[PDB]
Amino acid sequence: SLGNGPILNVLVVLGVVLLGQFVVRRFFKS
């Protein structure tokens, strides 16, 4: 990907990962 150096790229990665984890929790919860 382009612009890996910039901090913005890092933030994007963190955001998507966390979102996925939340979804998993919801599934477990009934």
Cα 20 from Cα 27, distance rounded (Å): 11
Experiment used for this model: NMR
Distances (CA, A) of 6 to 15, 24, 27: 15, 30, 34
- The full DSSP string for the chain is ----SSHHHHHHHHHHHHHHHHHHHHHH--
Please check whether residue 14 is in contact with residue 6, taking contact to mean a CB–CB distance below 8 angstroms. no
Cα 19 from Cα 4, distance rounded (Å): 21
Residue 12's nearest CA partner among 23, 22, 27, 1 is 1
Please check whether residue 10 is in contact with residue 16, taking contact to mean a CB–CB distance below 8 angstroms. no
Show the tokens assigned to 4: 């890996």
Cα 11 from Cα 17, distance rounded (Å): 10
